[PDB]
Structures are given as structure tokens and as C-alpha cells.
Amino acid sequence: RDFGRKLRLLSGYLWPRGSPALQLVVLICLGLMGLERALNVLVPIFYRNIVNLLTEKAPWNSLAWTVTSYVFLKFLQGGGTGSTGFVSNLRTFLWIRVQQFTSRRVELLIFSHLHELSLRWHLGRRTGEVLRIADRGTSSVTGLLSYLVFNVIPTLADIIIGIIYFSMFFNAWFGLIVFLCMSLYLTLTIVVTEWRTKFRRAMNTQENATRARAVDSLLNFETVKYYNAESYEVERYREAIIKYQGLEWKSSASLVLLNQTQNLVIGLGLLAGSLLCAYFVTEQKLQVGDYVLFGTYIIQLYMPLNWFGTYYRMIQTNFIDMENMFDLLKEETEVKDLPGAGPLRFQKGRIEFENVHFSYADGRETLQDVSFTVMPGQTLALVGPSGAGKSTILRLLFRFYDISSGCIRIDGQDISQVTQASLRSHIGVVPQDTVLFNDTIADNIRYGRVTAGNDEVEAAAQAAGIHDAIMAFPEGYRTQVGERGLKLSGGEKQRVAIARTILKAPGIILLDEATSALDTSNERAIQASLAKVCANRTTIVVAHRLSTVVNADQILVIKDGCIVERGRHEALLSRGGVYADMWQLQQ
Amino acid sequence: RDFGRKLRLLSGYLWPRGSPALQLVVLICLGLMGLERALNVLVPIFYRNIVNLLTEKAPWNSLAWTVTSYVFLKFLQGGGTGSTGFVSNLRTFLWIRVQQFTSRRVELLIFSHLHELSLRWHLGRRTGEVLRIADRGTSSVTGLLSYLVFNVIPTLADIIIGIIYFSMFFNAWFGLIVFLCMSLYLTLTIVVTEWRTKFRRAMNTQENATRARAVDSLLNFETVKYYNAESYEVERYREAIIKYQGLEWKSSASLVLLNQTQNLVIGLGLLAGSLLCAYFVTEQKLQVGDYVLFGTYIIQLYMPLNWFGTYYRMIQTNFIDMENMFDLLKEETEVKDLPGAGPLRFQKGRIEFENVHFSYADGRETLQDVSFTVMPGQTLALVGPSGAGKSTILRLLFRFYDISSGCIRIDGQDISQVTQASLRSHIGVVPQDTVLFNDTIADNIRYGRVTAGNDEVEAAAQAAGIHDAIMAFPEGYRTQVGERGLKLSGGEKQRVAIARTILKAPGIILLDEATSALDTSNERAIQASLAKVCANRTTIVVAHRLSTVVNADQILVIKDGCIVERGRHEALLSRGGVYADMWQLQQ
Ligand SMILES: N[C@@H](CCC(=O)N[C@@H](CS)C(=O)NCC(=O)O)C(=O)O
Ligand SMILES: N[C@@H](CCC(=O)N[C@@H](CS)C(=O)NCC(=O)O)C(=O)O
């Protein structure tokens, strides 16, 4: 039933293909499992020997030695519920290390491969669902291995070994009795389990619904604002509670029924076995100790079978979760890749366009036959209505999609024939809302270059005029910054964005202006700093204000993928066309 | 150790003081617990009888009947791990019903009392934390009762009963042996359960930190935007994983030690008992069956005492959660309430203000000596800068806070000592951002009156001009609406707000103008509807546009708690004051 490939993948993930100091640990763990399985069978034999020696008035010495050996063996073996003895504890003590190793490896792998994807897929689904999928996937990879290997194979092996022992060394009917009892136990526990899976899921769905209902009567506090509607909400909560309680009652009972069907089957068992053994004993066919041996063996072999239910249920789920996570990882639809080879030669920073058409969505087209060429060092600007074309062309400048038709070349070299690393390193981008994550300002600034020391940080503090503002803070570089720490203003995060821009030392500045209201002096200082970092550097600015455009060397207007102005600035001044639009935009 | 009052409260919650059909259930459950405890002691006596009868070659009939009785008894008693037998399953089968009843009652109580609170407390902390506190509180109330009553008292009772039995009917030294073994087991379990507690909490904190770290590398997709910072994020994740794995390893190692300290104190005890019993057997002081009897009793005590060991931590945690939930319920910070008695009768709706002072924050004061009086049917309006005073006075019209100093009267009756029910019933309020929860629009409309039938819904749909939209939707009143369903426009939700306003049919309309830009024809239709619902009804409107002011009878301007305009509409037009502000607002 397609289990072959599944088990092959599980085996692949089991063996630590890496460090050679862990295969020895795995071998030791398997040997310990084998020793535990042997002890589990050979303890009752010593119990029977003790009883037999006691019933024939043996001398004290042999009795003492045998009882000491039996007690030591019981201590080594699981002295109850399987998972108590010394052997199982050592097995856990090594498997924790091996499990941590494998979980770390798989988690790093999935994290890196998920981070390697493109943007469209990352906007396709929300982050919470995918993070939950990943966490459940790694938890399943560990737990399914643990559950199967160390709780479902040992139990079946114990069952088979006990059947063989009873059929060979004890009699010919006890084997049949045990086999029938265990077969009935297994099949009944399996079915009952499916019926219960049904009535249960329905309980989890109802619980999720009744929990979601509760939130929207505490997060939507308009009840009193509208009317005296406390009674209505109370009644609705009562009805939801009633439904959930009914489903819960049905579930819990299924469990009581699985539990008792089991406690019966094992019992019809004991009876049959105990009655037959007693009858065989009373006619000198067996010994006294055989009775206690059979009782102890049946009890001890039934002991780890009490959870087969939970185990079926889970070994299933975790398989579904593994399917989901492997489907996530196996996806190869990440079409933003690179050619076979070819670095980038950033000679001077030439940018050219040749009738490029692109539409980020489907159905209709937004950008078509856009063509313009910018001399290096000139601060070209883009203006237009409230549209998404500006952001689109911003992204195609940054190799964030794949152009459907056209060509984008830089310095006489196509950007589609080079790796993303150099092209993205040479360009610094300032977004509208520069949001930062939870860390100190020191690593925030060093985020520009990992190998750059604090010398570049001091240089940036001197250059960007942030030294006085930074040292004004009494907490120093170890200040708690972010949503966890203190809040900052928009101007401050723009300033730190310029700081990391100077850290980058880029070749092109594809900056986007923020729309924050501020005094003209601070904005002019910011623009002066931007000019002094983009001096003798290509610059593209997107804004709705003419202050940055009046001194700009070239201005373009985009109207649904159309450009109607070109040439030098004096030509546009002499046009006298939408210059009315510029006049009415100036005020 | 302060346990007395806590146990008294637990006893209070245990007995269902309500319906008379559950006292019988509780009595039956306690009787079943007692019967289980008796069986758990009296089974090994039958085992010893069987062995003794087998060793003296008893006749077959007595042996068969005794063995059948013993097997039946084992089936009735827990045939392993305590929670398997028929008796325990029946106890669960009734406790599920009683637990559902008590949980439902406590949850409804806490929900209603929490919903009765005021607003400032609800802005003191977010809803998620308080809801999680409530849910943990109810879960603890159920689980702590279950854990204690049915798994910590029975085990200690079993220990004491076994000690008594061994000291009385068996010998004078087995009691000492068992007592010493059990005392050592308990004390070692307690101490190792504490040291491990520490190391562990540290594991939970580290896990929470690492998990929270992952979300801020997927909700902050700026890595590609800034620079090739995949390596830095991968390294940071690796370091966090390393720290978490170290803490996890320490915790697992601690667990492996508690387990074995136990499996020893049990091994030492069993060794001593078995050796002494065998030596006493070899000198004809005891019987053969006493050996198997002693062996079979220790195993029982051990199962339960194992999981006992664990249950310490949980009783402790929960008692913390119960303390938190009871502290939440005992909170009395609801200062917006009503005097000892006094209903309200609304005649016509006179409103007067006599130099009232109010400050919702602390330190400074915002609203002071505010005085105005509104004739019925006059749409009095407030205007000013970007300030919250307008919303504040909107709130004080609704008895949403307590006036610091002054006098507020409606219809010549002070509102500070009247019931909130009628006072909020006679007044309808239209907010700016009307948020609704997950349900159909039919209930959204019916929200006006719980007792109102569909006849009023049809009449209001005809009156408010919303029937055409209803017929437009092919799903009718049964359309799936809300954030889970399809979205609606701002104009539509304002319209449904007016619809529920007509459902209320109030006497005073403390409406607030919507801040949505829309076609002037729809706005004039909305204004006509508002006039036709506010005809011969008092109205107060807050807006920054002159559309609601041109026809207004009286307009007030707030200047950080100052009012300088008063009089009739012609009077304020002729005053020649902030009329300049009116002209400069128009264009
Ligand atoms: N009756 C189950 C016992 C399994 C069990 O009780 N384990 C706990 C989990 S720690 C459980 O299942 N209780 C909650 C549930 O019903 O799922 C079986 O025989 O497999
Ligand atoms: N040897 C453990 C057995 C109990 C146990 O391990 N139970 C599970 C809970 S189902 C557990 O504790 N695992 C998580 C943990 O280590 O706390 C003890 O004596 O406490």
C-alpha cells in the first residue's frame, strides 16, 4: 500500500549521514532494544524457577542466589509499563542527542529552502499557516520515527516471540489461546478506533468554532454601545457550549467503549488460559510455577498494548503531516533563477530600456513598451497618479520578477544573464515604510556588511550626521530597539535607512520617498545627505512632490504603462503641455 | 500550608449545588472509588489462595471455581496501570457528565461577570491575555479537581491500607520495609521534581523565544530587498537552535534521573522484601503463596506512584492558574454602576450642561466648564481641530465614564443616579467605524430588538430603502456575511447602521458623521434618511464638513476644553467670529 517508498524515506532520515560519532550511538541503542526484548521474555522463566525451588524445600543458598539474580534482572528490565527499567532509560539518554541532531538538520534545511523562494508564492499564503505547517512537519519527522521504531515494532516482536515460546516450550493449546486473544484485541481496537476518529474530529471542529465565537464578543465591544444585548450574547454562548458538550460526551464514551472492549478480550483470555493451566496442573502434567509464569507473562505482554490506540491514531496523523511538509519542500515553482554562470561587471552604471512589456497580475496588462535611458549620475524621477505602476517598475529594476517580454540591460549587459547576488548588492533601496526587526542598533547598522567592523559604523555616524543623535541616547549601542523596545518616529527610521545605505556603498539608488509630514529644513537636510551619498552615482526617485523634481535632470510621467515625455529638461520646459499639471501640483 | 481554604473552595465547586439529579451521581462515583480501592487490595488474597490450593493438590472442582472467581475479580479490578478495570471506566462514564455540568456553569459565570466590566479596564489590557487567563482558569478548575480527587487521594489511601495489611496479617517487618521504601520514593521524587522544574521552565522560555524569532524573518521580507543576508539569518537561527537544544538536553537528562532514582528505590525495596520473605518461607514460618502475594502487591503500588511523581508539577501549576482566575473574578474595578435603586422615565429629551469638568487621562484636564442646552429636533453640531474632545463628550452622553465634577441632567433628571438600562435604551448611537462579527445580515438587522419578529425587519427594509440591495443578493437574508463571508462597502455598513437605528426607534440620536468619501447623491439620500428618522427627534452631529452644519440650528467649537460660540443659527452667522474658519473650511 505504497508503504515502501515511505519507509525508504524514513530510513533515509534515520541514519545520521554526517558525523561518524553517532552511528555508534545508534548501534548501541538498537543493541539495548534487543537486550530489553530478551529480558522481557527471560524474566518470567526466572520467576518460575524461583517458585519451583521454593515448592520443593530447596536449601537456603540456592534460593538466595536465585532470588538475588531475579531481583537484579527485574531492576534491569522494565519494572512496570515497559518504559521504566535501566535499559529503556539509557536508550532514551542517547536517543535525545541523536534526535536533537536530526531535528536541527531538518529544521535548518526546510528554513533555508523556504527562505529561498520568490515573492509571489510568499504573498500567495499567510505566514502563520506556513509556519504551522513547518513546525508540525519537523515534529512529525521526529515523533513518527520515535513512536514506530521504539513502540510498535518492539511490541509486535514481543507478541511473536511469546507466541513462539508458548507454542514450543509450554504446550500446543496455549499458543492458540494467546494468538486468538491478541488477534481479537488488535482488530477490535483498530475498528473502534476508526469510528471514534470520526465522532472526534467533529469535536475538534466544534471546539474551534465555539472558541472563535468567544473572541468576537470581547474584541468587538459594541454591545453596550448599541443596546442592552448582554442577554442575547449569553444565550448564544450557552447554545454553543451545549453543542460542544454534546459532541464531547459522545467522544468520551467512545473511549470508554474501546477501553472496555479491550479489558474484556484480555480477560476472556486469562480465563481461558488460567483455567486450562490449572486443569493441566492438577493432573501432574505441569508444575506449580507454570501457573504464575503464565499469569505474569500475559499481564506483562498486555501492558504495552494499552496505548495501541493512541498510537494508531498518531502514526496516522503524523503521516499526513509528513505528506504536507514534503509536498511543501518538493515544490520547484520558484521561477526567478539564474543562468549557468556569468558575474556582473559594474563599470559605470549604464541603464537602458527596450520596449519592455510586463504585467504582474493576469488577464490585463499594466506595463507595455516602456523605454528610457538614464545617464550616470543623473537623478531621474518618476511621477504619476495613485497607481501601482511606479512600484512595478521599481521591482523590475531589482530583478524581483521575470520579464514576460522585452529586455533589461545594465552597462551593456542584460540583467537576466547574471546572478542575483552582485546585481542586488550594487543597488540600495529605501522603501516607504522602513520597518525593523527586534535587535540593537549596532547589528542593525552592521546589517549592511557582515564583515565590516565598527570602523564603518563610526564612519557612517560621522557622515550621516547621526553621531550626536545616537550619543544623545544614554543607553548606548545596547539599547532595546524594535517593537520589544522603545518606539521611534518615521524620520528616525528613514535616517537609519540612509545609514544602512551608506553601509552598503551601492552603485545605484532606487530610492522611494516617504510621505511623512515634516518641516522643510529636515527634509532638505535629508535630501542633501541623499545627494551626497548618490553624488557621481545613478539615482532614481519616486515622489509626488516637485521639490525633488525641479532640480532633477529628467522627469518621466507614467500613465498605465505609457510615457509621453522624453528628452532633456529644457525640452520639457519648452513643451508647455501638462506643465499646467505641474503648476497646479506645485501648490 | 494555606491548603485549607483552597480545599474548601474545591469542595464547594465539587458538589453540584444545583440540579438534584447529580448528587446521586457523585455518591455513586465515590462508592465506585471505594469499591475499586477494596478490590485492588483483595485480589492478591485470592491469588495467594489459588497458589496455596494448587500446591496441596486440591480437588478439581474447588480449584476451578476459585480460579474463575479470581479471573472475574481481576477483570473487575484494574487489570494493569490502574485505569483499565470496569469500575474505573464506569466512574469516568459518569464523571464526564458531571464535569461538563460544572465547567459549563463556571464558564458562563465568569463570562457574564467579565462582560459586566467597564471600558477603561478593557483598554488596560488586551483581550487575548484575559481570554487566555479565563480559559486556563476553567481548565484548571476541572483538571485539578479530577487529578486530586481521583489520582492522589486513592494512591495514598492504597499505600496506607497496604501498610496496615502487611503490618497486621503478614508480619512485623514487611510493614517497616514497605514504609521505608515508599517514604524514600516520595521524598526523592519531590526533590528531583523541583530541580527539574527549574531547568525546564528555562526550556519553555527559550522555546518561546526561538519560535517568536522565526515569525520575524517571514513577516519582515526585507532580506532580499536589502542585501544577500540569507547567511546572517541562517547563522542566527542556527545559534538559537543550538541554545534551545542545550536546554532541552539538560531537561531530558534530568528526567532520566528521576526515573531511575525511582526504579531503584523500588528495586532496593523489592530486593529486601523478597529476600526476607524467602528466608522466612524456608523455615516453615510462611506459605508458598505468600511470596507471589508480596511480589504482586509491590508492582501495583509502583504503577500508581510513578505517575504520582509526575502529578506534583501539575497540581502546583494549576493552583497558580486557579489563583489567577479567582483574582480576576474577585476584581471590583467597575466604577460606572448604579445606586441602590431608581428607574428612569423619559418624557421628551431635555438636555442641559452645567459647568462640568472631566479628565479621562491623568495629570492635566481636558474638558472643563462645558455648558450647552439643545431644543428638541435641533441638530446641534461640534467642530474643532484634530482633537478627541468631540468623541469624549460623545462618550459622556452615553454614561460610559463617571463625571469628575459637575452636574449632568436629562429631562431635568440627573443621570449619575439612574439605571443604565433605560438610559442606553432610549438613545441610539451611530459610530464611525461600525465593526460587526461573524453572522448573517439578517441577525445584524434583528439586533435592534431580540423580541422583534420579521415583520419589523420587512418594515424597516421598506422604510430605509435597503430592499433593493437585499433582492440584489441571490442568497437573500441567508447570505454568509462578515469577515469570514464576503466583504461589504462603507456605505452599505453605514446604511445597515441606520437600519438598526430604526429598529431601535430611539428618542435621542447621538449620531456621529461617517468619514467616507462618496458621491454627493448618495450622501444627500443618507441625509434625507437621517432627517426622516430624526424628525421631531433630538439630534447631535459631529463632523468636519459644512454639509451637516449649513442646516444645523446651533454649532459649537471646542478649543482644548473651551467653548466660545453660542446662540441661534442666525445669531452665530451674525456674530462675525470664526466665520473666517467656516469660509476657509469650505474650500
Ligand atoms: N484508551 C486508550 C488510552 C490512551 C489514553 O488514554 N491516552 C491519553 C493521552 S495522554 C488519551 O487518549 N486521552 C485523551 C484522549 O482521549 O485522546 C487506549 O487504550 O489506547
Ligand atoms: N517518568 C515520568 C513519566 C511521566 C511522563 O513522562 N509523562 C509524560 C507526559 S504524557 C511526560 O512527562 N513527558 C513530558 C515531560 O518530560 O514532562 C515521570 O515519572 O514523571
PDB file of N, CA, C and O and ligand atoms in Angstrom, chain B residues 196 200 255 258-259 262 306-307 309-310 313, ligand 2:
ATOM      1  N   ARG B 196      14.261  19.819  38.455  1.00  0.00           N
ATOM      2  CA  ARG B 196      13.908  19.690  37.073  1.00  0.00           C
ATOM      3  C   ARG B 196      12.979  20.843  36.739  1.00  0.00           C
ATOM      4  O   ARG B 196      13.110  21.414  35.712  1.00  0.00           O
ATOM      5  N   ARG B 200      13.645  23.199  33.476  1.00  0.00           N
ATOM      6  CA  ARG B 200      12.621  23.167  32.442  1.00  0.00           C
ATOM      7  C   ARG B 200      12.008  24.471  32.106  1.00  0.00           C
ATOM      8  O   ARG B 200      11.941  24.850  30.947  1.00  0.00           O
ATOM      9  N   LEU B 255      15.087  14.322  33.543  1.00  0.00           N
ATOM     10  CA  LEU B 255      14.008  13.334  33.570  1.00  0.00           C
ATOM     11  C   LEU B 255      14.553  11.917  33.695  1.00  0.00           C
ATOM     12  O   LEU B 255      14.024  11.101  34.465  1.00  0.00           O
ATOM     13  N   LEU B 258      15.201  11.244  37.403  1.00  0.00           N
ATOM     14  CA  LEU B 258      14.123  10.977  38.330  1.00  0.00           C
ATOM     15  C   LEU B 258      13.658   9.580  38.055  1.00  0.00           C
ATOM     16  O   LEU B 258      13.395   8.800  38.984  1.00  0.00           O
ATOM     17  N   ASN B 259      13.582   9.188  36.797  1.00  0.00           N
ATOM     18  CA  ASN B 259      13.034   7.873  36.520  1.00  0.00           C
ATOM     19  C   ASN B 259      13.858   6.828  37.205  1.00  0.00           C
ATOM     20  O   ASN B 259      13.316   5.949  37.834  1.00  0.00           O
ATOM     21  N   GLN B 262      13.762   6.580  40.911  1.00  0.00           N
ATOM     22  CA  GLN B 262      12.658   5.788  41.366  1.00  0.00           C
ATOM     23  C   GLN B 262      12.931   4.302  41.129  1.00  0.00           C
ATOM     24  O   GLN B 262      12.994   3.541  42.079  1.00  0.00           O
ATOM     25  N   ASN B 306       4.313   6.021  40.307  1.00  0.00           N
ATOM     26  CA  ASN B 306       5.034   6.636  39.189  1.00  0.00           C
ATOM     27  C   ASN B 306       4.339   7.813  38.594  1.00  0.00           C
ATOM     28  O   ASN B 306       4.732   9.106  38.499  1.00  0.00           O
ATOM     29  N   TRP B 307       3.196   7.406  38.110  1.00  0.00           N
ATOM     30  CA  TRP B 307       2.677   8.682  37.548  1.00  0.00           C
ATOM     31  C   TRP B 307       2.438   9.752  38.710  1.00  0.00           C
ATOM     32  O   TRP B 307       2.107  10.941  38.431  1.00  0.00           O
ATOM     33  N   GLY B 309       4.498  10.689  41.163  1.00  0.00           N
ATOM     34  CA  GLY B 309       5.573  11.558  40.960  1.00  0.00           C
ATOM     35  C   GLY B 309       5.228  12.593  39.945  1.00  0.00           C
ATOM     36  O   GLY B 309       5.198  13.756  40.247  1.00  0.00           O
ATOM     37  N   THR B 310       4.961  12.194  38.709  1.00  0.00           N
ATOM     38  CA  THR B 310       4.676  13.421  37.818  1.00  0.00           C
ATOM     39  C   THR B 310       3.618  14.384  38.354  1.00  0.00           C
ATOM     40  O   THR B 310       3.917  15.515  38.557  1.00  0.00           O
ATOM     41  N   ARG B 313       3.932  18.400  39.694  1.00  0.00           N
ATOM     42  CA  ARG B 313       4.041  19.638  38.976  1.00  0.00           C
ATOM     43  C   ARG B 313       2.698  20.145  38.587  1.00  0.00           C
ATOM     44  O   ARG B 313       2.405  21.303  38.794  1.00  0.00           O
TER      45      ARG B 313
HETATM   46  N1  LIG C   2       8.977   9.141  34.124  1.00  0.00           N
HETATM   47  C1  LIG C   2       7.949  10.148  34.033  1.00  0.00           C
HETATM   48  C2  LIG C   2       6.709   9.525  33.433  1.00  0.00           C
HETATM   49  C3  LIG C   2       5.612  10.556  33.243  1.00  0.00           C
HETATM   50  C4  LIG C   2       5.814  11.192  31.904  1.00  0.00           C
HETATM   51  O1  LIG C   2       6.926  11.218  31.421  1.00  0.00           O
HETATM   52  N2  LIG C   2       4.736  11.691  31.308  1.00  0.00           N
HETATM   53  C5  LIG C   2       4.852  12.491  30.112  1.00  0.00           C
HETATM   54  C6  LIG C   2       3.556  13.241  29.807  1.00  0.00           C
HETATM   55  S1  LIG C   2       2.358  12.379  28.747  1.00  0.00           S
HETATM   56  C7  LIG C   2       5.965  13.458  30.327  1.00  0.00           C
HETATM   57  O2  LIG C   2       6.247  13.820  31.453  1.00  0.00           O
HETATM   58  N3  LIG C   2       6.604  13.883  29.251  1.00  0.00           N
HETATM   59  C8  LIG C   2       6.997  15.269  29.137  1.00  0.00           C
HETATM   60  C9  LIG C   2       7.927  15.623  30.261  1.00  0.00           C
HETATM   61  O3  LIG C   2       9.081  15.161  30.235  1.00  0.00           O
HETATM   62  O4  LIG C   2       7.493  16.337  31.183  1.00  0.00           O
HETATM   63  C10 LIG C   2       7.615  10.613  35.405  1.00  0.00           C
HETATM   64  O5  LIG C   2       7.812   9.839  36.360  1.00  0.00           O
HETATM   65  O6  LIG C   2       7.154  11.757  35.540  1.00  0.00           O
END
